[PDB]
Amino acid sequence: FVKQHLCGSHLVEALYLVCGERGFFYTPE
Amino acid sequence: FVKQHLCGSHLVEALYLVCGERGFFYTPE
Amino acid sequence: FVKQHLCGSHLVEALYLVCGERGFFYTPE
Amino acid sequence: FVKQHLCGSHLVEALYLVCGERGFFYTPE
Amino acid sequence: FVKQHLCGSHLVEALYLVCGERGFFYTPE
Amino acid sequence: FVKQHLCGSHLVEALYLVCGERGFFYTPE
Amino acid sequence: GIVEQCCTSICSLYQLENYCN
Amino acid sequence: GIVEQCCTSICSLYQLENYCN
Amino acid sequence: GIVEQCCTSICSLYQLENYCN
Amino acid sequence: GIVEQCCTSICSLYQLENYCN
Amino acid sequence: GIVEQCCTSICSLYQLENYCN
Amino acid sequence: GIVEQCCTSICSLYQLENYCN
Ligand SMILES: [Zn+2]
Ligand SMILES: [Zn+2]
């Protein structure tokens, strides 16, 4: 796939596309 | 704050708006 | 809630989450 | 320009694309 | 309509609003 | 990668995430 | 109103301009 | 869970705070 | 106003409530 | 086509790659 | 092309019509 | 971590799989 440059809400949308209703964790450090 | 139906991508976008740098967990069903 | 840094369309999405089908005004100066 | 069903978040995103710095009012129902 | 400043995914959302289920081509150079 | 229903705006956003600078074609129905 | 015109019915970006300031 | 509370039922941004770290 | 504030500074969701119909 | 494969049916990001240039 | 124009400059919705199928 | 990486550098969709439940 292309590599990603994802900031802010755009990374949460990408995690929804990768994980969907499996669920995921959004975990800034 | 209005109560509304928030689902799928729009629900995790809402979690990003309310939690931000705190992070969140999206663990449906 | 976390404070917000919202530019462009991201603030209209946040106003939809806060107001929903109550409606809202998007009013740049 | 295609005619399509635009609802909820997607309808106010469309209002942002067409009105931008003019602003808009979203006053449903 | 207002002129547009659209980067990344925001231009694909604008092409969906202009073309919808007609379909479109997203064609970076 | 989860399999999920991707439709309309969300489907072309997904095409943008996977194809990016390659471009894509969205030619439904 | 705007929901009947653009959500339950269909509209294009021209009818949207009606709700610009 | 969160789908029943906010998607099939309705919730506001206050109930969302329940799923913040 | 709020549109400028939230983009050049920070704003709160409690401020956006003021723009509801 | 892509609607039957990914919207009415389900698909993952691998089938999406089929519609990349 | 249009992808670059709209991001480094400005573009119009009338230009994007050219990319419809 | 991943949130910072994807915004200041680049990240891959294979890395995001690690954050699924
Ligand atoms: Zn949607
Ligand atoms: Zn953005």
Contacts of K11 by beta carbon, 8 Å cutoff, 6+ apart:
E3, E4, E5, E6, K2, K5
CA–CA gap between residue G18 and residue D25 (Å, rounded):
10
Bridge partners for F26 per DSSP: E24
Neighbours of B13 (CB within 10 A): 20
Q: To which residue do tokens 């967990």 refer?
A: B25
Distance of CA K1 to the CA centre of its chain: 8
Amino acid symbol at L18: N
Q: How was this structure determined?
A: X-ray
C-alpha distance from B6 to closest chain A C-alpha (Å): 14
Contacts of K7 by beta carbon, 8 Å cutoff, 6+ apart:
E5, E6, E7, E8, E11
Q: Do I20 and C27 touch (CB under 8 A)?
A: no
Judge contact between C18 and H16, C-beta under 8 A. no
C7 inside 8 A of chain D by CB: no
Judge contact between E12 and F12, C-beta under 8 A. yes
Query: Which of C1, C17, C18 is opposite residue H17, by nearest beta carbon?
Result: C1
CA–CA gap between residue A2 and residue C7 (Å, rounded):
26
What is the DSSP-derived secondary structure letter of residue K18?
G
B20 inside 8 A of chain I by CB: no
Which own/partner pairs from I8-12 qualify as long-range (CB within 8 Å, at least 24 positions apart)? I10/C3, I10/C4, I10/C5, I11/C3, I11/C4, I11/C5, I11/C6, I12/C1, I12/C3, I12/C4
Classify D24 as helix, strand or coil: strand
Classify F19 as helix, strand or coil: helix
B16 inside 8 A of chain H by CB: no
C-alpha distance from D12 to closest chain C C-alpha (Å): 7
- CA of residue D13 to ligand 2 center, whole Å: 12
- CA of residue A10 to ligand 2 center, whole Å: 7
Closest CA to D14 of F6, C18, G5: G5
What was the resolution (in A) of this experimentally determined structure? 1.2
Contacts of K10 by beta carbon, 8 Å cutoff, 6+ apart:
E3, E4, E5
Q: Which two tokens stand for residue J9?
A: 């049916």
Closest CA to K13 of E25, D4, E17, D26: E17
For chains A and F, what is the number of CB pairs under 8 angstroms?
26
Q: Do E17 and G13 touch (CB under 8 A)?
A: yes
Give start and end residues of each alpha helix (H) in chain A: 9-19
Cα distances from B21 to residues B17, C25, H16, K19, L4, in angstroms, run 10, 27, 15, 38, 11
D25 inside 8 A of chain I by CB: yes
CA–CA gap between residue D24 and residue G16 (Å, rounded):
9
Domain edges within chain F: 1-29
Please spell the DSSP secondary structure of I1-21, one letter per residue.
-HHHHHHHS-B-HHHHGGGB-
Q: Which two tokens stand for residue A1?
A: 């796939």
For B12, the closest chain C residue by CA position comes to: C17
